[PDB]
Amino acid sequence: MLIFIPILIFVALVIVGAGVKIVPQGYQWTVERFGRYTKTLQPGLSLVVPFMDRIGRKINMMEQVLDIPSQEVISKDNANVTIDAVCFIQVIDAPRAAYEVS
Amino acid sequence: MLIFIPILIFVALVIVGAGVKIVPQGYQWTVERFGRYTKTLQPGLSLVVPF
Amino acid sequence: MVVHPHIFWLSLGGLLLAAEMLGGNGYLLWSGVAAVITGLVVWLVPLGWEWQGVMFAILTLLAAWLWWKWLSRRVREQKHSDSHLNQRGQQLIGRRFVLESPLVNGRGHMRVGDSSWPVSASEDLGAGTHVEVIAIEGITLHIRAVSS
Amino acid sequence: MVVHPHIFWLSLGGLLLAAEMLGGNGYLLWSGVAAVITGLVVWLVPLGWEWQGVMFAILTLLAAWLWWKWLSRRVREQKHSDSHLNQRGQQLIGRRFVLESPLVNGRGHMRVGDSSWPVSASEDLGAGTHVEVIAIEGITLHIRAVSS
User: Fold this and answer.
1) Which residues face the membrane's Periplasmic side (chain B)?
2) Nearest to D21 among A7, A18, A39 (CB)
3) Any idea what DSSP says for residue D1?
4) Which of residues 16-35 of B touch A (CB under 8 A)?
5) Residue C11 neighbours by CB under 8 Å, 6+ apart
6) Is D53 within 8 Å of B11 when comparing Cβ atoms?
7) Which chain A residues touch B44 with a CB distance below 8 Å?
8) CB burial string C121-144: b at 16+ within 10 A, e below
């Protein structure tokens, strides 16, 4: 009546705001149901029942360049040299990269 | 009556607050019954009888 | 100012649809569409003021709900360019390769591109056999011998 | 202001359901739902003011109670992705390996991945036998011989 209507509008806005997820290209998301992992979201539109599901973590899915700091190594000829190295890392679509290591 | 109702609301809030446990992914919790270890909680919703 | 109820709705709907185009995430769409429909319903049918907000909220919920089924029906069995775009593990399925080192105990490594990948097979396979990938587990590739 | 009892409940329920979406842990849900149901009961049925709080508290308790059974029924015999996700000891069950060093006194070490794990078996097993894991105790793996 007098005070119900603004509350109803606000409730509708909040539920739609927190129940609709859009995932960009080059990423995947994870859905936690009260904490437990249940499923993963690919890029697109996704509806998750609110107040029970939330977003776990954001997983990049593109090759990444990763420096390795300077390092001192001894060769087989007993030669002391210093090197630096670079790495490429890619995450296979598994959710493991979020929950199997910190 | 006059003073029971607010106390009842507060009691309900406290019991629900301290009896419902949610465990994140990548962790496990342990439940102690007056001090003794009884069981372990995996990630999810868990009800433990409070106090 | 207030004698006309539908004007408020048909203004708010347009304003929210316009606010979309500022760089939104599609959150405001689901309410603007509902506001437009609420205006087109109230203007034709004089619903009660306490019966307006309920219909507007329900219309927002259904506005958000219907396109999910529309889009999801569209995605499956029809679109596959993005499905094969950004998942490598499914890309390698079905490809054929050759082996340079024999598998011991049904496990080893195989050269792909310029790098190597771990492979596992049901039986020990010698060096120089044509193999084809079937499934992927973790990062390990299941391979089986295939005739040329 | 106070002549309408159901309005208070149907406002508090909505406000708590909204307070959820600020980043809560689900604590406030169980009372907001009860408040909404209390409003929908008082509005239809004029219960006594001293008979409102009791029903609201009992409704909070049952609101928290029912979903536990719903979710727990859902989890068992239906969902296993998270069950096999973050427990390694159960992952190794059923896998097959080979031995490089003979077991002495029914105990030894076995190579898995790039590391080693302690193993125990009922009888002494020589080097080069196919073995399969059965159970796990502490970090020790029970193995038994299996034919190829």
Assistant:
1) 1-2
2) A18
3) -
4) 22-26
5) none
6) no
7) 33-36
8) beeebeeeeebebeebeeeebbbe
